[PDB]
């Protein structure tokens, strides 16, 4: 009948808490002695071993819509992209009156504004200025507020424009994350987790797998695949402002190409500065494009609809192309080959789905010969999503460009109204919803090893 | 795309009224939208503007009295009007504008392409 | 790390496990320092709570503090048989601070005073 | 914090008080780190002085070191009755280092050697 | 610092010596912090290895762990008479980790469990 | 001045011209400085 | 401004005590400090 106090130290007990996570990298180094990648990723302790431990009889709640680490990921990407342009040249001496006629190689018709944009540049004795010319993709040029023969850089009355430096060309590097001491990272390890509620399947790791800092518009690419069926995650399906996330279980190969070449040219600016531009264009003219397997797209979106109608357990479903705004929110943007691409994806979401009406499937669409083709444009001056007021310029890449990618997920938005039915279309924009699409498996907690209880000693 | 309007009507000075403007083919919440009014036999005049971002600008003559709000479940906008005056009498219009503002910065401009048929408002004693 | 979902009696068997893991260029540099110093601070806070409670080098220590029935009415069998420390902590959280206050002086400081008095002339 | 102006005997009653408080972006960032690390360093220095003196987990510890009458001639009654530790420290400051040197080895290290010798075969 | 070239038995006499020395603007600022924090980390790692091994405040501690003849066949006289700790460490390096693993729980944690069991009702 | 730079200055001045000024209570000033002197003469315990 | 070729004639008002007469003809004037030090504008968010 004696019950005395006792204390224990080392108790396996934790609480949800806000803290700072730390980056961890792969064994291979950048090896370019750059501040923002090598001194930021290649100098970080490498190859953490995810010796995960599974936990018996444990339950934990996981909120992917509200967590504390996605912000840090946004934070790091912004920091890196800022640091990237710290040491390389500003183009301030360049935004000058531009005299640019429209011509091209062998036969003018395609320009679309590029050819022989002329300008005065004073170099390098600051007295001997010379007349030079170069080509800029039309969408980067604006007509000057006056005579139509005069043109201006798109952004130069408003912001500072910087050239990107060749050693700093940033390609995705898988970033792992580690918690400091006293903190632990827990994974719900479910194959049908929707992003909320309790999870009867918990393990812990000292390290997360690499997640690549991929910047995306609507589609999810280079991403991980769902283990079972396609999974649809939304904060509130009945709320019309909440973005819907589609996580596929099977990737879809997409092939994009810029099939023409361009000769890279350089105009000196000063002691260690040169502006890179497009010279001669060679040799034939084709618009950059992307190719897709019809049947895979098809069965894919069909399963997407069949799963989607669960959250709206009723009348039929309709997809529409993008609606309007800046093409950023309307097209498929990416950066294959270091040049930036914007594909008009309207042809991709022009379908409907009925109930039981007809399922003619003898077609087998056709002998792997119906490739869906989409046109794209490209650009150079980039006001990255990360910031406003500081535009990045991009130098042209000589030769042509191929790029092949896996398609893994979709970022949709919805619309209520029309007759009795539901309508959706590609949404996107918010960078976080990209990273939220993979961090949804992780929560961080703190460990408070002190505890007390009764015992029989004294 | 189409816009359709409802509401308006009759009111004494100082009363309140409300007009709805719903869209089809596209959502209000991601476009540039304009509220205008036209007094009988007279010209058009600006009333309110809501950008794609959802911030709203009012003309001075109705600031503090008119308010526009999004009805996302109905895919519409609502012009609520309080402290009505005689001068507010006229036909009101909700309209959609198409512009091109690349990476923020603008280059191209179409104008007002979609126009609702207008709702009648009469402030009288 | 691996006894959480277990019963308190079970979890008690493995405590040094946590004991081992409790402890141990402008973007991350400040961050690493903040984290390491925070770790040191928390560990030393716990060590100091021991130092005042006694029990410095013992992961388990039993001492003269009677337990209040008002904090909980549950049986020892019930508490040690089929409960996780997670749940236990939840129930005791409210009286935790009072327990710490009592244990910090009434137990160990009275001990020190009366002990030196025993050896006193 | 609150016993300074008191007599030594009085001040002795409350020592854990200090024990609790002894421990625990380019303008202040370096500064905070310097301060925190300095705190850790001082606290660990004191802990190490204990570790060599023994008395690791005891705010009071009494041990075999005879006191020199040459350091001070005052009576225990006089020293514990009506003096503040502030004044006491002032008087003892000169012999403090010698006291530390003697207490560090002659007390505890002779103890360790002779103790293992006792258990020695 | 001064007993290295000496025999183990000799070197053992002077250990607090090391104990004292084991511990305690953009070019060096980060550097000083890194160094100081590293020092704290190493010292606390050793303190934690003690805390799990027991022997917290004793530079020498003897405990119930039998020695393996397979680690070395040498006589105590031979090992303590004419060898430096430098050489000894070289020979034992391979079994050092196994020794640490055994000493960490089988010695001290079994002790804790059985000890509270002794006082247990 | 350039891309994100502008110098701010004075344009038209409106509308009437008065020099900036400050106002004080005489009596408070007065009693104040009197007490000031009465206390000051302590440190120079002598002539005026 | 801002094409670094189209310079324009502007005017503004500066409180007299901030202006000095240039070391030459009395019609010419100079900022008070500019042969000697760097002058910076204070930024609206940083008004302390
Ligand atoms: C995930 O997302 C990325 C982004 O699109 C895709 O990664 C691309 O993968 C292809 C193929 O692996 C890469 O193409 C390779 O480029 C190499 C040169 O890259 C360096 O140099 C350029 C300038 O020239 C820099 O801009 C660039 O950053 C690099 O520093 C070539 O050397 C490669 O050729 C080699 O392999 C071929 C065979 O494939 C051989 O014939 C050659 O002789 C040579 O050995 C190749 O051309 C491309 O660079 C990658 N881009 C990025 C940004 O990483 C993935 O495809 C995508 N995956 C999925 C599933 O979506
Ligand atoms: C809760 O969900 C998790 C999954 O998120 C699950 O943990 C997984 O359990 C399965 C089965 O217990 C593990 O499968 C095997 O595990 C061993 C070691 O864990 C691996 O070495 C195995 O890899 C080989 O075998 C596979 C076929 O089984 C091969 O496909 C593979 O290529 C290898 O040849 C295999 O993975 C699985 O590893 C874990 N997950 C992780 C991350 O370790 C858990 O069982 C679920 N159950 C409960 C009750 O919560
Ligand atoms: C510079 O760009 C212009 C504009 O694209 C190029 O010429 C343009 O060619 C198109 C294609 O026909 C013309 O559009 C249409 O032309 C028909 C007659 O061909 C006309 O009836 C339509 O009303 C419409 O305009 C366009 O008019 C024409 N523009 C000009 C100025 O000729 C031109 O080839 C490019 N290169 C130069 C001018 O060196
Ligand atoms: C992985 O996650 C899925 C969900 O994402 C888990 O499915 C969940 O299973 C539990 C128990 O089977 C369900 O609770 C049950 O609800 C029904 C009502 O639908 C009720 O009648 C039962 O008595 C029970 O309470 C739970 O609803 C279900 N989740 C959802 C969203 O419906 C699954 O258990 C997880 N683990 C795996 C697959 O190992
Ligand atoms: C990704 O997930 C999808 C969705 O589950 C998987 O689709 C599966 O596809 C097969 C092939 O058509 C389906 O088989 C058919 O099943 C129906 C009943 O479900 C049956 O009536 C038909 O005769 C035919 O056998 C299968 O059902 C379907 N899965 C489900 C749950 O319906 C797809 O295989 C997955 N792929 C990857 C790579 O993960
Ligand atoms: C998830 O989204 C759904 C749909 O957007 C939310 O349900 C809706 O919640 C709103 C706000 O509470 C309700 O509005 C209210 O309507 C009543 C009608 O009399 C009105 O009196 C109130 O002043 C308010 O305007 C709306 O009726 C309701 N609709 C339905 C069908 O439930 C739901 O709350 C959201 N859930 C979360 C967790 O955000
Ligand atoms: C799913 O894949 C099928 C594979 O072809 C695609 O639907 C196909 O769409 C084409 C063009 O609309 C159809 O050609 C048309 O067929 C109708 C009769 O069905 C005929 O009246 C028209 O003149 C034209 O020839 C094609 O038949 C149709 N095939 C199938 C199997 O549906 C499409 O890419 C995917 N479906 C959707 C809804 O996007
Ligand atoms: C841009 O360059 C073109 C190419 O020379 C200029 O066009 C010339 O204009 C002058 C002035 O009328 C004519 O005498 C030449 O015959 C034109 N040449 C050609 C090939 O068209 C144009 O004036 C320039 N724009 C400027 C300087 O603003
Ligand atoms: C560089 O600047 C010069 C000077 O303004 C430009 O040359 C002038 O062009 C106009 C219109 O063609 C003529 O009326 C002037 O007589 C020219 N002056 C001189 C000194 O050349 C020239 O067009 C500019 N070139 C570029 C590429 O910017
Ligand atoms: C494009 O899609 C078609 C069908 O969607 C793929 O056809 C596959 O062909 C292989 C070889 O016989 C079969 O084993 C698969 O079952 C077929 N797929 C389906 C979904 O039935 C075709 O391979 C796809 N093209 C590429 C390049 O993968
Ligand atoms: C998970 O829960 C079950 C049941 O609550 C635990 O089952 C115990 O298993 C051990 C060893 O097999 C037995 O000695 C106990 O008697 C069982 N108890 C009960 C109530 O069934 C199991 O131990 C739990 N797992 C963990 C890791 O705690
Ligand atoms: C302040 O000084 C006075 C006198 O030196 C102290 O008075 C003591 O008060 C306690 C409690 O009231 C008595 O038990 C002592 O006998 C008194 N001693 C003397 C010499 O009068 C008082 O304690 C001092 N205050 C503090 C906080 O030390
Ligand atoms: C250096 O080596 C010599 C010989 O190995 C050591 O000589 C010892 O000296 C002490 C004191 O003079 C004697 O008690 C021992 O019996 C000697 N041993 C031998 C084997 O000669 C000497 O101690 C060593 N020096 C140090 C600092 O260890
Ligand atoms: C009593 C004793 O043994 N020693 C001294 C005593 O000689 C002295 O008179 C007194 C001063 O107050 O302090 C005590
Ligand atoms: C240049 O400006 C003058 C001024 O009005 C105008 O008449 C002329 O047409 C302009 N030239 C071009 C090509 O716009
Ligand atoms: C359902 O699909 C039919 C055709 O199968 C279509 O005509 C109808 O408009 C749809 N209705 C609803 C309410 O979705
Ligand atoms: C691209 O450049 C390479 C190398 O100059 C050349 O061999 C190839 O034909 C070019 N292709 C095109 C489409 O211009
Ligand atoms: C350029 O085109 C040629 C032929 O069309 C092709 O072999 C080559 O792979 C292409 N290179 C790139 C980088 O697109
Ligand atoms: C122990 O707990 C049980 C509940 O399982 C209770 O019935 C009993 O009274 C408690 N006390 C004992 C057995 O002394
Ligand atoms: C402890 O206090 C919290 C906050 O008031 C309360 O919610 C909880 O029910 C309390 N629990 C007990 C056991 O007193
Ligand atoms: C002690 O070491 C010597 C080697 O010097 C050896 O001959 C002897 O067997 C060892 N063991 C003893 C003396 O028990
Ligand atoms: C100062 O400015 C306000 C607003 O323009 C104006 O109403 C007021 O009369 C002005 N006062 C003077 C003294 O100029
Ligand atoms: C003292 O005050 C008198 C008038 O009251 C003045 O004339 C005289 O100069 C002052 N003398 C000194 C020494 O301050
Ligand atoms: C300008 O300089 C000349 C050179 O001596 C001088 O004669 C003239 O008066 C000056 N003008 C003014 C306004 O100072």
Automatic annotation (TrEMBL), chain A:
Reported function: Envelope glycoprotein gp160: Oligomerizes in the host endoplasmic reticulum into predominantly trimers. In a second time, gp160 transits in the host Golgi, where glycosylation is completed. The precursor is then proteolytically cleaved in the trans-Golgi and thereby activated by cellular furin or furin-like proteases to produce gp120 and gp41.
Positions of glycan attachment: 116, 147, 190, 201, 222, 236, 249, 261, 293, 298, 316, 344, 350, 400
Region: CD4-binding loop, residue numbers: 322-332
BP term (GO), one: viral protein processing
Protein name: Envelope glycoprotein gp160
Domain Human immunodeficiency virus 1 envelope glycoprotein Gp120: 4-104, 111-458
Protein's organism: Human immunodeficiency virus type 1 (HIV-1)
MF terms (GO), sorted A to Z: structural molecule activity
Section of the entire sequence shown: 31 to 485 of 846
Location within or outside the cell: Host cell membrane; Host endosome membrane; Virion membrane
Region (V4): 343-376
Post-translational modification: Specific enzymatic cleavages in vivo yield mature proteins. Envelope glycoproteins are synthesized as a inactive precursor that is heavily N-glycosylated and processed likely by host cell furin in the Golgi to yield the mature SU and TM proteins. The cleavage site between SU and TM requires the minimal sequence [KR]-X-[KR]-R. About 2 of the 9 disulfide bonds of gp41 are reduced by P4HB/PDI, following binding to CD4 receptor. Palmitoylation of the transmembrane protein and of Env polyprotein (prior to its proteolytic cleavage) is essential for their association with host cell membrane lipid rafts. Palmitoylation is therefore required for envelope trafficking to classical lipid rafts, but not for viral replication.
Additional information: HIV-1 lineages are divided in three main groups, M (for Major), O (for Outlier), and N (for New, or Non-M, Non-O). The vast majority of strains found worldwide belong to the group M. Group O seems to be endemic to and largely confined to Cameroon and neighboring countries in West Central Africa, where these viruses represent a small minority of HIV-1 strains. The group N is represented by a limited number of isolates from Cameroonian persons. The group M is further subdivided in 9 clades or subtypes (A to D, F to H, J and K). Inhibitors targeting HIV-1 viral envelope proteins are used as antiretroviral drugs. Attachment of virions to the cell surface via non-specific interactions and CD4 binding can be blocked by inhibitors that include cyanovirin-N, cyclotriazadisulfonamide analogs, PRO 2000, TNX 355 and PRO 542. In addition, BMS 806 can block CD4-induced conformational changes. Env interactions with the coreceptor molecules can be targeted by CCR5 antagonists including SCH-D, maraviroc (UK 427857) and aplaviroc (GW 873140), and the CXCR4 antagonist AMD 070.
TrEMBL record, chains C, D, E:
Coiled coil start-end: 90-121
Disulfide-bonded cysteines: 55-61
Positions glycosylated per UniProt: 68, 75, 94
Region of interest called Immunosuppression, as start-end residue ranges on this chain: 31-49
Residue ranges constituting the Retroviral envelope protein GP41-like domain according to the UniProt record: 8-121
Domain of life: Viruses
Membrane topology reported for the UniProt record: Single-pass type I membrane protein
Protein location: Virion membrane; Host cell membrane; Host endosome membrane
The protein's name in its UniProt record: Transmembrane protein gp41
Organism: Human immunodeficiency virus type 1 (HIV-1)
Taxonomic lineage: Viruses, Riboviria, Pararnavirae, Artverviricota, Revtraviricetes
């Amino acid at each position: 009948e004696n019950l005395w106090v006792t204390v224990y130290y080392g108790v396996p007990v934790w609480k949800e808490a806000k803290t700072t996570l730390f980056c961890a990298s792969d064994a291979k180094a950048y090896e370019k002695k750059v501040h923002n990648v090598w001194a930021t990723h290649a100098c970080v302790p490498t190859d953490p071993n995810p010796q995960e431990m599974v936990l018996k009889n444990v339950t934990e709640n996981f909120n992917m819509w509200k967590n504390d680490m996605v912000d840090q990921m946004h934070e790091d990407v912004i920091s890196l992209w800022d640091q990237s342009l710290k040491p390389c040249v500003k183009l301030t001496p360049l935004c000058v009156t531009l005299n640019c006629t429209n011509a091209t190689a062998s036969n003018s018709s395609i320009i679309e504004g590029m050819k022989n944009c002329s300008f005065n540049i004073t170099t390098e004795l600051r007295d001997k200025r010379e007349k030079k010319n170069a080509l800029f993709y039309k969408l980067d040029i604006v007509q000057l507020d006056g005579n139509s023969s005069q043109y201006r850089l798109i952004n130069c009355n408003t912001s500072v424009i910087t050239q990107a430096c060749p050693k700093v060309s940033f390609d995705p590097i898988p970033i792992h994350y580690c918690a400091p001491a006293g903190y632990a990272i827990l994974k719900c390890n479910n194959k049908t987790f929707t992003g909320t509620g309790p999870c009867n399947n918990v393990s812990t790791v000292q390290c997360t797998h690499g997640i690549k800092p991929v910047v995306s518009t609507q589609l999810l690419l280079n991403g991980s695949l769902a283990e079972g069926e396609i999974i649809i995650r939304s904060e509130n399906i009945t709320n019309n402002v909440k973005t819907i996330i589609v996580h596929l279980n099977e990737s879809v190969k997409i092939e994009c190409t810029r099939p023409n070449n361009k000769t890279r040219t350089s105009i000196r600016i000063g002691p260690g500065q040169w502006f890179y531009a497009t010279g001669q264009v060679i040799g034939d003219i084709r618009e950059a494009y992307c190719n897709i397997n019809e049947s895979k797209w098809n069965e894919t979106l069909q399963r997407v609809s069949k799963k989607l109608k669960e959250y709206f357990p009723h009348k039929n479903i309709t997809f529409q192309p993008s609606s309007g705004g800046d093409l950023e929110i309307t097209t498929h943007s990416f950066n294959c080959g270091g040049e930036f691409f914007y594909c008009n994806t309207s042809s991709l979401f022009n379908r409907t789905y009925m109930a039981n009406s007809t399922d003619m499937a003898n077609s087998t669409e056709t002998n792997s010969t119906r490739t869906i083709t989409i046109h794209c444009r490209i650009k150079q001056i980039i006001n990255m999503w990360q910031e406003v007021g500081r535009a990045m310029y991009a130098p042209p890449i000589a030769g042509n460009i191929t790029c092949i990618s896996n398609i893994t997920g979709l970022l949709l938005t919805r619309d209520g109204g029309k007759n009795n039915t539901e309508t959706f279309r590609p949404g996107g924009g918010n960078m976080k919803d990209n990273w939220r699409s993979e961090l949804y498996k992780y929560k961080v907690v703190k460990i408070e090893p002190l505890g007390v209880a009764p015992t029989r000693c004294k | 795309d189409r816009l359709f309007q409802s509401g308006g009507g009759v009111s004494r000075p100082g009363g309140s009224l409300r007009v709805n403007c719903g869209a089809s083919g596209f959502t209000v919440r991601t476009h540039y939208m304009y509220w205008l009014r036209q007094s009988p036999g007279k010209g058009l005049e600006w009333v309110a503007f809501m950008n794609s971002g959802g911030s709203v600008s009012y003309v001075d003559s109705v600031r503090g009295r008119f308010s526009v709000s999004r009805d996302n479940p109905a895919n519409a906008m609502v012009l609520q009007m309080d402290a009505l005056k005689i001068e507010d009498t006229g036909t009101y219009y909700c309209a959609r504008e198409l512009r091109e503002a690349w990476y923020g910065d603008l280059r191209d401009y179409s104008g007002l392409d979609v126009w609702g048929r207008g709702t009648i408002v009469s402030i009288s004693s | 790390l691996g006894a959480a979902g277990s019963t308190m009696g079970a979890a008690s068997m493995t405590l040094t496990v946590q004991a081992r893991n409790l402890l141990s260029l402008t973007v991350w540099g400040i961050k690493q320092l903040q984290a390491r110093v925070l770790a040191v601070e928390r560990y030393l806070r716990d060590q100091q709570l021991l130092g005042i409670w006694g029990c410095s080098g013992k992961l388990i220590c039993c001492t003269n503090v009677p337990w209040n029935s008002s904090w909980s009415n549950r049986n020892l069998s019930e508490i040690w048989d089929n409960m996780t420390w997670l749940q236990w902590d939840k129930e005791i959280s409210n009286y935790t601070q009072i327990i710490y206050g009592l244990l910090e002086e009434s137990q160990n400081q009275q001990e020190k005073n009366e002990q030196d008095l025993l050896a006193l002339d």
